[PDB]
Write a protein that binds this ligand. Structure first.
Ligand code: HEM
Ligand code: HEM
Ligand code: HEM
Ligand code: HEM
Ligand code: FES
Lengths: 122, 85, 181, 39, 383, 383, 122, 85
């Protein structure tokens, strides 16, 4: 698995340089729209692989409102997959609501883990 | 582990979500089986077609080229090229 | 509490106890169709345990009959079990002439135990713990079961021992110098 | 139980239905119907 | 407590069948496992009824099979089952691997499970191959011969291991007898491996087509996914009947009905269909040792897959490029299977080499590269 | 947690082998269980190596065994292991029943375990008998014939069940082939029953020679009762080697080395020694149906034992009369076994009838009456 | 298993009659002496089959001092059986100390269970 | 159940009991094995002998009488008595 630290490292490596930014970012939005997760009510961070101690810590340190909203969105996605139907365009998650809410907590978890690893090998 | 038993499945604290449902014996079974199995199945196939068609088109084009070349090789006109290989 | 979602369209039109009755009907029909299919499959598989066509064909095999010394006991191999074909002389027939309504676990006589005294057919397998009896050790003059010391009469009747019945007579028919099973 | 007995009902029903439809669809081909010609 | 929980035996049966908290969003693909288990029963069941009539002697193996077909009451049914059911066992196993490859069922929490999966696969192939050798037809005998000759390529022990396999100096009576014994046996080792598979599944549960955690909405199994298991089982049995009763020899090869004769090699040697892909890989590599190593790698690289898959998101259902890569891989695998049965000819040697190259490149390049690219694309798009 | 607890499979191995809380006061008798498992492995292991050379055809069975003995490299060793190891399997199983009878291992908390025990016993007997039928010596063939003839005594289905058992009209090729198949199989069903036995043991743990609760003082298994199991295992293997390598045919019957001939019965028909007691019971009852019913009861009544034993105190170790009753029962069981191999003669028919009478009377009279009497005697003594 | 209530019923049926008492009671003491449990430190009530709901309740309702004494006697018995040795006659449980301490609680548990069964079938 | 794992084996509240022991490496192995295996083994056999001897004596007496009678029957002087049975 790739760490959010490394994913964000690469993403900021690309975003800083105008040529790669202009080429990719339109392709990034196009890929995220064709991904089809937004049509099921899921934000991107709902898709993240929860089954890891870092990620488990990240969810365990979410605020109350974000935690409950995530629970409801995951349940809605499960129900939609269960009934083989999608949210109408008006009810789907819009690009501006895919706000990367969980990334900061995962980054903090990885920062803690990386400092612990570095200091254990001081 | 990441999945306990029913009492504690590892789901985060869940709250404010109300789940309504109706009983069977009181719901129309196969409510939209006929119309859905056509329209929704067509919709799903439309969404997922390209992912199966582009790889299939590529692989089957390669296979067709190889098969036609092999058939051509073993003919009275393909004898020379077969010898050269 | 609050306003429930409207299920009007999802609601069934059929009676409260009727739809569950129909559900019972189809669930039981599925169960019994599955039982019938399982019965068919299990019967088909177990039918393999039964005698294959080869074994059935091999059985009911005629035996090369013909002239043989009187009183001599020939041996055959019909259906695996030994067959003690004996051409008992008239002396054996006369001895069997003595009727026995008592002191015999199964009163019988050559009237039913043999079609003709010149050709006597009787399976050699004993009754209790089926074994090949000795053709001359019988206490009654016929076959003897060495395993338990049982004595088989010249007519095949069980005279003494742990015999549960009398010497079984195969279903072999007789013909002109031939055995027709 | 009644499962054992009931299975007989369905097994016999399907068995007789098929063993009555088959010798009607194929009556012109089976042995028992053709043997007369060669006797 | 209810009897289905108080009793330890019924407690186990409950934990696995009646109350297993399956996720509510699993497709019909998750039913394949049950079918595989069902097939494992059928293979065993019919299998146990064939050994009751099969005679493993080389001079009796083929005649004994024909005795089963012609003389035993339902022997034709038992043989056609045991064979087409093996073919269907591998159909369902390939579908179960394809599902686990499409959805990230091999990722972190279930890596252990995945490993047993692979082992099962490997073991199964052996069993199937070994069982096929029992028929001792032309293709049976010559498949055994080719396999042992290829295994003769081990650097130093190769010259010595083969006689231990053959039990002699060529595929003969000892080889067929040991194949029969190990073939009767290894299915029970596979049953134990399946029990281990189910334990590794129960520890962390099953995944979802969406990939996200199912803990938020999980359903029991007795009223749900047992009656879905019945749909899948009855569809399986219906197709299995369409094969067993109608055109039962479609999947097999006609040459297998010619009794084995070492003095005449048949025109072409092909395994039974489900092993064709790997066979193709074996022929794509010229070196015999290279070929066997490459083949066993083609099977084992599934183990590397969970680590080469650098995807933050489990599964392909929400990934554009990875779905294309997966379907391209599946169609190349079918192409390898096709090339397995085709003669080594001018275009096909190069096509098979390229197909094997891409088959391994999938795991060791495409999955990591595509997964990393899609992680970056996801993050950039949302921002 | 330690790897031996976190991992699922290592967690199971820990629960059953490393950390299982055994009572500290258990004798060497509690090691017999382990031996049985070891024996179950041997019977399987050596067994699998005999199916690699055994040809189940009737005209090749005995000759195939002789080929194993004389031609296969270590074939003599494997055959002697497989035979004397079945004999030792039954020795250890009789000791494991005798222990469970002496100490109240069958009482309230462990009845299910006891029940599985009985089933295992039943199943094993079948297996062993079936394995014997594979040698197809004189005694092999005629034992098969006698068993089938007696089973033909079922009121109505008897005449129809036996041809299914034979696969023909007498013990012949189909019978031996199906016996080989079922004999190869049923050992794995027995392994499953053994796993069920182990789960039913683990749910409540094992008893004590003192009978009182062990929870007050229990010990882990890895340092303790593993090196006790090693002592017992090496004693077992030392005696097993004394038998296998020196006088290997002591337990077997010489007539089994005469190839089976349906047309000439041997002077006396006797099972392998471990089935003699029940055989004796079978001949004690005159009626064939009565004989079979009494024979099967002679085993199944162990199920009735946990309820007829009305003792408030588990076990015999602290009970005077119950110990006399148990030793009398054991010696009568040995007497039945001895009578099994003796001919039906003047004193022995009556002695066998009396021995069977007391064998059943133990369970249905002596155990309840003695247990109740001893309960009363205990209470009166302390007051 | 014989309910302790039935055992006491039989014991008082015998004890009440002077002839049966004079006959059995000497044999009762002799049998409890030959039983051999006293030389291992166990009182009679230690031998009782603990694995029953009635017996388990009776143990659960023992006084603290009796409970600890029972625990130590059971532990001593286990150690003696473990080391294959017996207590010296001076240390063995004398007949007077085999005092039937647990029977009253067992009888109370049996009474409660029998009343519950009787009323459940009223 | 009636036996839990190590934390709670189902033992009653146990208290006031002190257990002492010494390391195996600090203790003499097989101290009195020679003397124990003789004297204590003889003591155990003495205690348990009668329970195995009285049943054994009874059963072996029955077996010996039966065997001797059987031997007597199959002899020239036992012929008549064998015939009567
Ligand atoms: C997953 C487990 C198994 C698989 C995949 C499997 C598959 C196969 C296959 C494909 C064949 C080729 C037969 C033919 O082409 O005619 C075969 C043969 C055979 N198998 Fe199995 N098998 C399995 C387990 C078993 C078991 C447990 C037995 C127990 C007896 C068994 C007994 C046999 C026998 C006797 C044959 C000889 C074929 C014949 O005589 O027609 N198999 N097996
Ligand atoms: C007899 C053969 C097998 C049996 C009976 C079996 C059993 C099962 C069962 C019951 C399930 C749950 C239902 C499902 O997820 O489909 C499952 C899932 C799975 N199968 Fe198997 N399995 C077998 C072979 C294999 C093999 C050979 C592989 C891979 C090489 C494999 C990989 C998996 C994985 C990874 C899962 C977990 C799926 C998930 O959680 O998404 N299995 N298996
Ligand atoms: C392959 C055959 C068997 C195996 C591997 C097996 C396994 C075991 C094991 C591992 C133990 C624990 C160690 C011990 O208590 O000695 C045990 C105890 C026991 N054995 Fe078995 N067993 C087998 C057959 C039987 C049979 C046939 C019976 C009775 C008919 C039986 C009755 C018992 C009982 C009741 C216990 C519990 C002992 C106690 O708690 O006091 N076993 N067994
Ligand atoms: C608890 C399980 C088993 C028991 C108690 C057992 C016992 C026996 C016994 C007593 C015999 C008679 C052999 C003789 O007297 O020469 C026998 C024969 C045989 N058994 Fe086993 N067996 C077991 C499991 C197995 C297994 C798993 C196999 C696997 C192949 C097997 C294969 C055979 C074979 C091939 C024979 C033929 C005997 C011969 O050729 O010498 N058995 N068995
Ligand atoms: S010989 Fe056993 S009863 Fe006839």
């Amino acid at each position: 698995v790739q760490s959010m630290t490394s994913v964000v490292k690469a993403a900021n490596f690309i975003l800083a340089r105008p040529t790669l930014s202009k080429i990719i970012t339109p392709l990034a939005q196009k890929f995220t729209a064709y991904a089809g997760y937004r049509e099921m009510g899921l934000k991107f961070n709902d898709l993240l692989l929860e089954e890891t101690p870092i990620m488990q810590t990240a969810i365990k340190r979410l605020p109350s409102e974000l935690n409950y909203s995530r629970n409801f969105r995951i349940l809605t996605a499960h129900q939609l997959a269960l009934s083989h139907q999608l949210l109408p365009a008006e009810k789907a998650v819009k690009p501006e609501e895919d706000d990367n809410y969980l990334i900061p907590y995962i980054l903090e978890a990885e920062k803690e883990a990386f400092e612990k690893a570095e200091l254990d090998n001081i | 582990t990441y999945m306990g038993w029913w009492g504690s499945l590892g789901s985060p604290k869940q709250k404010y979500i109300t789940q309504y449902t109706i009983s069977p014996y009181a719901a129309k079974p196969l409510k939209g089986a006929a119309y859905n199995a056509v329209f929704n199945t067509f919709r799903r196939t439309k969404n997922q077609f390209l992912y199966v068609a582009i790889p299939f088109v590529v692989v089957w084009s390669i296979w067709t080229r190889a098969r036609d070349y092999n058939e051509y090789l073993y003919t009275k006109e393909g004898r020379e090229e077969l010898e050269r290989v | 509490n609050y306003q429930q979602p409207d299920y009007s369209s999802y609601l069934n039109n059929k009676s409260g106890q009727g739809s569950r009755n129909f559900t019972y009907f189809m669930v039981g029909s599925m169960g019994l169709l599955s039982a019938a299919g399982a019965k068919s499959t299990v019967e088909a598989f177990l039918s393999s345990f039964a005698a294959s066509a080869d074994v059935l064909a091999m059985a009911k095999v005629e035996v090369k009959l013909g002239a043989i010394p009187e009183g001599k006991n020939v041996i055959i191999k019909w259906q695996g079990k030994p067959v003690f074909i004996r051409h008992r002389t008239a002396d054996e027939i006369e001895e069997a002439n003595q009727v026995d309504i008592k002191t015999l676990r199964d009163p019988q006589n050559d009237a039913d135990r043999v079609k003709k005294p010149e050709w006597l057919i009787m399976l050699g397998i004993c009754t209790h713990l089926g074994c090949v009896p000795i053709g001359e050790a019988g206490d009654f003059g016929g076959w003897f079961c060495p395993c338990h010391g049982s004595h088989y009469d010249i007519s095949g009747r069980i005279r003494k021992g742990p015999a549960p019945l009398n010497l079984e007579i195969p279903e072999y028919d007789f013909t002109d110098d031939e055995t027709l099973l | 139980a009644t499962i054992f007995g009931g299975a007989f009902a369905f097994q016999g029903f399907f068995d007789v239905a098929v063993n009555k439809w088959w010798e009607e669809h194929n009556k012109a081909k089976l042995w028992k119907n053709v043997k007369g010609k060669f006797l | 407590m209810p009897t289905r929980k108080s009793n330890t035996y019924l407690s186990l049966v409950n934990s696995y069948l009646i109350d297993s908290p399956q996720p509510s969003s699993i497709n019909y693909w998750w039913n394949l496992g049950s079918l595989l288990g069902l097939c494992l029963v059928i293979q065993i069941a019919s299998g146990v009824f064939l050994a009751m009539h099969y005679s493993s002697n080389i001079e009796l193996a083929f005649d004994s099979v024909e005795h089963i077909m012609r003389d035993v009451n339902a022997g034709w049914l038992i043989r056609y089952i045991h064979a087409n059911g093996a073919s269907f066992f591998f159909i369902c196993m390939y579908l179960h691997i394809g599902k686990a490859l499409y959805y990230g069922s091999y990722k972190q929490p279930r890596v252990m499970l995945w490993v047993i999966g692979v082992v099962i696969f490997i073991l199964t192939m052996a069993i199937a191959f070994m069982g096929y050798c029992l028929v001792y037809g032309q293709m049976s005998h010559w498949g055994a011969t080719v396999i042992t000759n290829l295994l003769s390529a081990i650097p130093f022990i190769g010259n010595d291991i083969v006689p231990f396999i053959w039990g002699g100096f060529s595929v003969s009576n000892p080889t067929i007898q040991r194949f029969f014994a190990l073939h009767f046996l290894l299915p029970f080792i596979l049953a134990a491996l399946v029990c281990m598979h189910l334990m590794a599944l129960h520890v962390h549960g099953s995944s979802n087509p969406v990939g996200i955690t199912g803990n938020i909405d999980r359903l029991p199994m007795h009223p749900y996914f047992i009656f879905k298991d019945l749909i899948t089982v009855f569809v399986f049995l219906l197709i299995f009947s369409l094969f067993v009763f109608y055109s039962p020899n479609t999947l097999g090869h006609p040459d297998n009905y010619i009794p084995g004769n070492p003095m005449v090699t048949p025109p072409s040697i092909v395994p039974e269909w489900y092993l064709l892909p790997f066979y193709a890989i074996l022929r794509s590599i010229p070196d015999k040792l290279g070929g066997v190593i490459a083949m066993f790698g083609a099977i084992l690289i599934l183990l590397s897959l969970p680590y080469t898959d650098r995807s933050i998101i489990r599964g392909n259902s929400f990934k554009v490029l990875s779905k294309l890569a997966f379907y391209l891989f599946v169609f190349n695998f079918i192409l390898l299977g096709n090339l397995g049965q085709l003669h080594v000819e001018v275009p096909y040697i190069q096509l098979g080499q390229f197909a094997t190259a891409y088959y391994f490149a999938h795991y060791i390049i495409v999955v990591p590269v595509i997964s990393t690219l899609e992680n970056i694309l996801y993050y950039i798009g949302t921002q």
